[PDB]
Design a protein around this ligand. Structure first.
Ligand SMILES: O=C(N[C@@H](CO)[C@@H](O)c1ccc([N+](=O)[O-])cc1)C(Cl)Cl
Ligand SMILES: O=C(N[C@@H](CO)[C@@H](O)c1ccc([N+](=O)[O-])cc1)C(Cl)Cl
Lengths: 137, 135
């Protein structure tokens, strides 16, 4: 009830702890820092400004800047202007989705796509609401 | 199933987005960065010796090392490293914000619906941890 908030916090912590570990090598192979990939996956969504990324993240603006340039030095992301992803950066995101999808299947081998449908409908609606709140200050 | 993973990925991204904005003013008011707040947030649960404090985040040796102490000074942390009273009070405040907003956002839902939501995230989390542990 405010216990769901905690669970949700724990659930997220776990996904990060897992995704981190699952993506270690690939990040090494790319030269990437964890916080850098999360920017790449953050842009995997479209294109954002360095303030947007800092404001959607909540870390020191300088740090976001230090990671945004390193991605342009590595040709992982390009510019419009705004900051898009480069193809090099895409094959990455693509190599990520592939590792994610392999494990997600194990853990969801025995589910009911109908069970899942309703649950997702409830989330898209919560997601919709979270976004509206965010825009207003 | 890739679209299911994209959504969860996005879903999370917003939650994180939103929590940041919603706590910014209060974290600034306590003089701490967001990153110092999960450090407290992880301790809202337990108390931890550096290793495990990093065992969840999994980032740098220095990132952990130069935020841990800051907090003792701000006086919201103790060493082990457990919460301090001022720290305990911060969380109380943090939980307020989060709960009112989450409530007033789920309010029109049939507990039955939300419950099946949590039950499917629990099964999913149960498998993650188990899998995590298998490294
Ligand atoms: O933006 C920053 N520094 C610039 C200028 O030196 C950048 O060159 C930089 C790159 C890498 C690192 N290093 O710590 O990973 C620091 C700074 C600040 Cl984090 Cl010091
Ligand atoms: O890896 C993270 N990065 C984001 C979360 O929004 C970043 O803004 C951030 C990192 C660490 C902490 N701190 O509380 O541990 C807060 C925020 C998690 Cl906290 Cl989700």
């Amino acid at each position: 009830i405010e216990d769901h908030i905690s669970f949700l916090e724990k659930f997220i912590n776990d996904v990060n702890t897992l995704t981190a570990k699952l993506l270690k090598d690939l990040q090494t192979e790319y030269g990437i820092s964890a916080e850098q990939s999360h920017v790449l996956n953050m842009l995997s969504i479209e294109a954002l400004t360095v303030g947007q990324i800092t404001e959607k993240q909540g870390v020191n603006k300088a740090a976001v800047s230090r990671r945004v340039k390193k991605l342009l030095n590595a040709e992982l992301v390009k510019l419009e202007k705004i900051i898009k992803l480069s193809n090099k950066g895409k094959k990455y995101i693509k190599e990520r989705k592939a590792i994610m999808s392999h494990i997600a299947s194990d853990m969801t081998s025995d589910f009911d796509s109908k069970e899942i449908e309703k649950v997702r409908q409830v989330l898209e609606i919560i997601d919709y609401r979270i976004q509206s709140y965010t825009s207003k200050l």
